Amino acid sequence: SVTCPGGQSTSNSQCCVWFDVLDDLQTNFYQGSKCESPVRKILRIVFHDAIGFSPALTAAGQFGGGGADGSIIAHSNIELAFPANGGLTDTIEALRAVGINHGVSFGDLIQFATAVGMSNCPGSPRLEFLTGRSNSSQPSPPSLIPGPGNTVTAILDRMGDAGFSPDEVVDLLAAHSLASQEGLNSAIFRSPLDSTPQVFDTQFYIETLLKGTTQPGPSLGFAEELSPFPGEFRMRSDALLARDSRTACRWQSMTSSNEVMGQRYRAAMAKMSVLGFDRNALTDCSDVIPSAVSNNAAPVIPGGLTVDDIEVSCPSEPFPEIATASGPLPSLAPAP
Ligand code: HEM
Ligand SMILES: *[C@@H]1O[C@H](CO)[C@@H](O[C@@H]2O[C@H](CO)[C@@H](O)[C@H](O)[C@H]2NC(C)=O)[C@H](O)[C@H]1NC(C)=O
Ligand SMILES: [C-]#N
Ligand SMILES: [Ca+2]
Ligand SMILES: [Ca+2]
């Protein structure tokens, strides 16, 4: 049966090359299978590559973007000049070299490096991995990536055009559970967006709902809001989507179960991975993706804050009963 050169069993012979790029990425790109900045930069890249897809531009007779086509690498010279693509150059060049060296398409490589990077982070689901996306791409049109200063209406229209419902936009944002910022407020470089930047969990949904109390840095950066405790950064779009009536009930439902969040995120990522492609024309190589270590911690409201400190915004559903922690308010270290 298809046994690959290294002796692993896979579904199709097209999956065998991916065991070599697995080894390369884990040893080199990810510095020994770690869940640090390279994983977080690849999650920004997979989103920025895939979202350059617009049915509305196509309808108006313009090129609407090829979706998850690897154009952010093949055409980095034009796409990294876009406002939302700062701080990605070094990661793009590292991925370029792996793609050229292994002979795999850039669009497939980005989806693969996302599933492999997430497997290094405790609590992650096993993402689907399909191979076969053409290596040819045209540059993404500008203005298709949502920005942190955009209103909720602007973000939902952009994401809706690409094909996501308001619920799926909230589901996709679970990736901010493994996040920090570097370019919005450089004075507090790598300030985390939740208290566990290395654990794929529910904390990001809980903590964005908390009352904004603290200014973490010397001044406020672009699209920065007050956060709940020292060291945590809060961006305006996340604060607004947590409280807006169109997204608030889904945001609240994401707070108490890591299992539900992981399933919803996996489904939304599988949809995003094939924007611009027919998934029935691709080959499934999901069995090449390893399991992540399980997260055994329960959701908690950190540092002595209680349910009275969260700004409940879903008028129909009572806030879930989440555990509290007896403690002084945390001060977060920079994400690694
Ligand atoms: C509603 C749209 C979203 C907006 C407006 C948004 C905006 C941003 C911004 C401004 C940053 C900080 C980047 C920096 O200064 O270094 C950030 C970080 C991040 N975002 Fe998003 N994001 C959104 C959705 C997503 C999605 C859907 C994903 C991917 C599945 C994603 C993954 C990440 C990750 C992992 C980071 C952390 C990067 C790092 O630590 O270096 N974001 N996002
Ligand atoms: C995918 O297409 C890109 C071109 O867009 C190819 O990238 C070039 O590859 C050659 C050698 O193979 C390098 O010297 C160039 O510097 C690369 N250019 C860019 C923009 O990266 C790539 O080889 C193609 N990959 C496959 C498997 O066909
Ligand atoms: C996130 N961009
Ligand atoms: Ca693209
Ligand atoms: Ca987290």
Swiss-Prot record:
Glycans are attached at N135. Disulfide bonds join C4-C16, C15-C285, C35-C121, C249-C314. The keyword Disulfide bond applies. One of its GO terms (molecular function) is lactoperoxidase activity. It is an enzyme of class 1 (oxidoreductase). One of its GO terms (biological process) is cellular response to oxidative stress. Its EC number is 1.11.1.7. Binds 2 calcium ions per subunit. Binds 1 heme b (iron(II)-protoporphyrin IX) group per subunit. It comes from the Eukaryota. Ca(2+) 2 binds at S177, D194, T196, V199, D201. Its main location: secreted. Its cofactor is Ca(2+); heme b. It is found in: Secreted. Belongs to the peroxidase family. Ligninase subfamily. This is Peroxidase.
